Design a protein around this nucleic acid. Structure first.
Lengths: 504, 88, 84, 90, 77, 74, 79, 90, 82
DNA sequence: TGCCTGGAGACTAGGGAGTAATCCCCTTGGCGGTTAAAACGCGGGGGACAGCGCGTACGTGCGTTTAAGCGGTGCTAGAGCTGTCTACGACCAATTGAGCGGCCTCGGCAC
DNA sequence: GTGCCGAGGCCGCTCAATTGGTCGTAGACAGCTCTAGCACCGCTTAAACGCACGTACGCGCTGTCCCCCGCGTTTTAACCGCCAAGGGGATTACTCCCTAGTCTCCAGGCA
């Protein structure tokens, strides 16, 4: 009864929906901080649904009769969804899409826009490209008295020129809306703190001290100065005991050795003498990049010279690199059990390689990347989600997956590799792990033993530990071993990520 | 100091440039004076043509287009500047 | 599938067209295009050779605008406005 | 090295009523610098040719004559003779 | 104003320069200078061949006209 | 070639055209003769190429005019 | 006085023949007369400039070669 | 002062069977001296451009590479590297 | 030594074109002069053998440069007396 | 082949050449997305081009005149070299003032 | 009518221009020798001129295929913004050994 009364009275015109308890408490906190005039950072959940609390907070302003212009900056991929959500949750709120090219700029700035504040003023939805270009032409012709921005992890530094355009703001109001707020270091937290509260986080000299007996107590002291208040101040609830609807999920990391042809290539390369050996067979300076590339598959270097646009026979690919042939037997396993298998990778130069492998193996070609346009992207999504379609592969670039594609219908996923950004991997697995899954998705990451990429993975774990701190305050897998590991922890050549939640 | 000859370029700076160029073992006293004289004639000539062009096109600015037009119009400057290419 | 574009033809057909139009040419033929590829290429290696000579002399394996403008001077065509 | 303020003051001398742009100063400074270089190099080479350990006004006039175009060169030699007479008067 | 597209031109210059000699690196200023030089040479040859064609009592330009101008200039490698 | 002492009077006329009381010596006159021959024969070769481009066996003066204009000195 | 007439019609004829010219038109002669007077006058202008540089009252092959080199005409045969 | 004796030695060592005329001697001496002048001037000029006070075999390297076209430059740089290595060893 | 390193250093000092030249640079430059003289005289001798005469003359030299592509490219803007 | 002039071997004293240390703005295979350009199709109309008649201007042969060219001849103004001595220019210490970097205003110009 | 933004005008600050003097020496100058250009003459003969004449070729016109040009339309690549972690140039300073200068012995290149 108290929750219903609060949601009704505090939100007199939230006409098109309802608010659950804890984010409603978040709304009352937001309202109080607006009464305190302080802006805050929203990062609550991996898109649980946030627009709901956006209307929850904003409609209170209209209910009080506090008319004032509203500014929103959001990624293009979700602007229409956001308008549908705001219309659904309150039909009583005026809003408009401010997108299109200079022609739609012209028509909107001719018709929909009054200088004076009034109830006839609708919510103006401006996309990112608008934020980069239209600074002078609009941000100076409006004292935008309400500003809210989504996907707030967009500003990773103080040099993202989105931010240099934004310094042309009348930034009285703010609401940073994002997901996970930590991006690989301290720089992006500092940037977002400056954006949200420049008058408070004025200088980085004091907080610069914490890029990395009494030091153990100092960890709380790092929290004590700011994060002891930030934790109530940052509206975001990690799941301690609320969404037990989240199904069971586990993921394992392999550590098998790497085969011969690539080790002789890397012996040539570490001395920067690979081109000398290929010259005998028939000069890339960025050594770490070539190390990664060789870790993927040797073809790239042949391919550097090559000319074998059409590439030599498949059994060679089988015989060069050990990780791909272990991938071959594991996909034999998965097709034996007939699961829907998701594959992800980082560079097209290997995406095409295993696409060619899968095609020549007699399997259907399912390739989606940033190079293909949008309508065929959804048609391939529909084909994959089709029950009558027996295809068990969806070749998707990891980076291109940031458009919010929902492919939870798959039953298994195979993360061939992992990127330097760990949360990027988290959305990569979230593409199928979101609520609605029916089967126990099981994920394997392929890591090359005795390789620098092991160190890349270890520092990825270091950044994961940084995530956890910010939040809180070599065998070959045999048939028996794999059946043991995928029963429906710690071992030689295989490691499962220990429970990242510190106890139920 | 330049008033001793009635010129308007840095006799000292052009002297230092001859010296630092080490173009010869020995430098004459009036050599910078004549260098400044020829340079001031050149500058006056080119700026005069630039001003005439500005008057001709009813404009109160001199721009690289102005410079290029002046060079390609004046026969003497064209001869002096054969392989001349002007940015913008 | 492996791909490697032609590059040398990257100077597009309209690029040649308005190069000629800026040059005052009115009516053009077809093989002008490939001939212009050839001309641009050959004009390119000369200045490239001069520039690489100066880069080697400067002990540096990067090119610089000073070396570029000196090279253009050496081939006998003065370019101004870049401080050279 | 910069002559920019001297380009400014020569503009004031000739036509102070007419403006000038940043790229214009750049191109004028390039013109002044490379004409300086050409005159100096021609004079130095000719001094090497005549086995004279000195460079002075006389070889500068002959270098000016050999490098400048005809009409502008007779104008230059006239004004420079006037200038060297003025400097000799001191 | 630049007339040839900058990114295609940078591929051209990078690839050709790599061919001639190894381990090279350019910058924005070097690319811009090369662009200006190429535009200048092309426009010069084009005006030369336009004069050649108009001398030829003809209005359509052909590579034999181009090659004529090339021969009088003499920079054939 | 051309006749030595006729070219000699021509050079004398050219000299007295500019500024007088100048003396010429034999190797200088010879060098002038060789240089003039070289430049003129080269110009004729260029004009012959221009004419064969012009699809006519005859060379007219506008051939030479074109060659000079292309060469860039006037 | 009007000494350029010394350059005779058979002279231009044979020089064009050396140039490989097969068929010479009638108006070539005056144009050749011109181009030679301009070329020679630039050369002589440079030569007299150098002789003035030499403080001497005669013209020598040495600074003649200097002038020809300056005119982008480089000559071998006189040092 | 010329290189008459040294060219005589060169011709007798490479093509002992054919002599040279006086005029041919003089013109090829002019050839040698003109290359002399252009190399010295180019090396000095590039040293001055480098703002470098002294010249060495490396500036001679860059000057020779500049003024010699490809195949001739390759042969010249090979023989020059051999000569400088011989001088270093001796 | 083939060319006079001492005397060529004497002319190079006479030019006084810098503070002082390299140590091995004079030997280098004598060597490069020797090389270039080598090919030019070699092709002059080839032309003479083509004509079978005991003295190489400016006509043979001019033929050599005008006929060898690379040498002519080096000496494009020069003419030989007679 | 004579010799005398320059060419070559040895000691020392600096100062450029190389070597070691330190930093950061530049580089690299991928993505979204966004425009203006660029690639392909087609009708056509202008021009490129083959062929013919002409009549006129240039190549060819030969008689006729012409001065360029060879061989001396005299002569002298100006070049090539040398001795002097004198003014002028390199080197160095103290001084400043005008040239160079930062800061700000205000008028021309597409809109 | 206007606002916006880059050039014109402002001051503060420092190192090279200035002055004076000294002293060493390159040029200004006079003067000589000689020689090479220069005016002059004469003889000789290949060469230039004129002219008739033929003929072939520039030219102007005619007549026919073909292929850029414009225009339209559909694709897509440049251009931009951004992600990722490191390295080659920039810069500074130290050190040390190469050789300029010099002197002394001797051989080779010009006449």
């Amino acid at each position: 009864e108290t929750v219903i009364k609060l949601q009704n009275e505090l939100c007199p015109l939230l006409t098109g929906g309802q608010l659950k308890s804890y984010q409603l408490k978040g709304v009352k906190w937001l309202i109080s901080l607006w009464q305190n005039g302080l802006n805050g950072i929203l990062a609550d959940q991996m898109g649980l649904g946030k627009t709901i609390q956006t209307i929850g907070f904003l409609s209170h302003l209209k209910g009080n009769g506090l008319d004032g212009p509203y500014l929103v900056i959001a990624p293009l991929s979700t602007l229409s969804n956001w308008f549908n959500e705001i219309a659904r949750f309150t039909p009583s709120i005026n809003a408009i899409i401010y997108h299109g090219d200079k022609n739609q700029r012209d028509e909107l700035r001719r018709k929909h826009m009054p200088k004076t504040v009034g109830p006839k003023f609708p919510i103006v939805i401006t996309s990112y490209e608008v934020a980069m270009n239209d600074a002078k032409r609009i941000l100076r012709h409006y004292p935008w008295k309400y500003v809210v921005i989504d996907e707030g992890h967009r500003l990773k530094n103080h040099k993202c020129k989105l931010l240099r355009e934004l310094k042309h703001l009348k930034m009285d109001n703010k609401l940073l809306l994002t997901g996970t707020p930590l991006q690989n270091n301290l720089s992006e937290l500092w940037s977002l703190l400056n954006f949200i509260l420049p008058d408070i986080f004025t200088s980085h000299d004091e907080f610069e001290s914490w890029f990395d007996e009494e030091e153990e107590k100092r960890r709380a002291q790092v929290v004590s100065k700011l994060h002891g208040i930030l934790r109530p101040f940052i509206l975001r609830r990690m799941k301690c005991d609320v969404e037990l609807s989240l199904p069971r999920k586990k993921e394992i990391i392999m550590y098998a050795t790497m085969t011969d042809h690539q080790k002789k290539f890397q012996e040539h390369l570490v001395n920067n003498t690979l081109e000398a050996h290929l010259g005998e067979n028939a000069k890339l300076n960025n050594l770490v990049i070539q190390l990664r590339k060789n870790c993927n598959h040797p073809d790239l270097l042949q391919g550097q010279i090559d000319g074998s646009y059409l590439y030599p026979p498949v059994e060679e690919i089988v015989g060069q690199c050990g990780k791909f042939r272990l991938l071959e037997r594991l996909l034999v396993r998965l097709f034996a059990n007939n699961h829907k298998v998701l594959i992800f990778s980082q560079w097209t130069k290997l995406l095409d390689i295993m696409d060619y492998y899968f095609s020549e193996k007699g399997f259907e070609v399912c390739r989606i990347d940033g190079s293909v346009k949008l309508d065929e992207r959804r048609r391939q999504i529909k084909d994959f989600s089709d029950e009558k379609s027996s295809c068990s592969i969806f070749l998707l670039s990891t980076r291109a997956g940031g458009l919010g594609i929902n492919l939870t219908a798959a039953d298994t996923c195979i993360l061939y590799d992992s990127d330097w950004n760990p949360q990027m991997d988290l959305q990569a697995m979230d593409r199928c792990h979101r609520i609605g899954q029916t089967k126990p998705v099981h994920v394997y990451r392929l890591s090359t033993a005795q390789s620098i990429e092991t160190r890349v993975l270890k520092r990825a774990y270091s950044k994961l530990k940084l995530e956890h701190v910010v939040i809180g305050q070599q065998t070959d897998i045999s048939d028996a071993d794999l059946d043991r590991l995928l029963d429906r922890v710690k071992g030689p050549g295989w490691e499962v990520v220990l429970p990242s939640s510190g106890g139920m | 100091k330049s008033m001793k000859a009635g010129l308007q370029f840095p006799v000292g700076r052009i002297t230092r440039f001859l010296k630092k160029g080490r173009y010869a073992q020995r430098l004459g006293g009036g050599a910078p004076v004549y260098m400044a004289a020829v340079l001031e004639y050149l500058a006056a000539e080119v700026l005069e043509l630039a001003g005439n062009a500005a008057r001709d096109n009813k404009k109160s600015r001199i721009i690289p287009r102005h410079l290029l037009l002046a060079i390609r119009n004046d026969e003497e400057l064209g001869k002096l500047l054969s392989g001349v290419t002007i940015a913008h | 599938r492996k791909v490697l574009r032609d590059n040398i033809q990257g100077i597009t057909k309209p690029a040649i067209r308005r190069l000629a139009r800026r040059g005052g040419v009115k009516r053009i033929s077809g093989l002008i295009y490939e001939e212009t590829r050839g001309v641009l290429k050959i004009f390119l290696e000369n200045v490239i050779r001069d520039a690489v000579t100066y880069t080697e002399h400067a002990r540096r394996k990067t090119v610089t605008a000073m070396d570029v403008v000196y090279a253009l001077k050496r081939q006998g065509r003065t370019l101004y406005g870049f401080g050279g | 090295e910069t002559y920019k303020i001297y380009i400014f003051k020569v503009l004031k001398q000739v036509h102070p009523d007419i403006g000038i742009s940043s790229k214009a100063m750049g191109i004028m400074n390039s013109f002044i610098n490379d004409i300086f270089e050409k005159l100096a190099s021609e004079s130095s080479k000719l001094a090497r040719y005549n086995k004279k350990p000195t460079i002075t006004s006389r070889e500068i006039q002959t270098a000016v004559r050999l490098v400048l175009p005809g009409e502008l060169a007779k104008h230059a030699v006239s004004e420079g003779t006037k200038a060297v007479t003025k400097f000799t008067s001191s | 104003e630049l007339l040839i597209r900058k990114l295609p031109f940078q591929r051209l210059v990078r690839e050709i320069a790599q061919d001639f000699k190894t381990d090279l690196r350019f910058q924005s200023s070097a690319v811009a200078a090369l662009q200006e030089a190429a535009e200048a040479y092309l426009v010069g040859l084009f005006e030369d061949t336009n004069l050649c064609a108009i001398h030829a009592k003809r209005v359509t330009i052909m590579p034999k006209d181009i090659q004529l101008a090339r021969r009088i200039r003499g920079e054939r490698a």
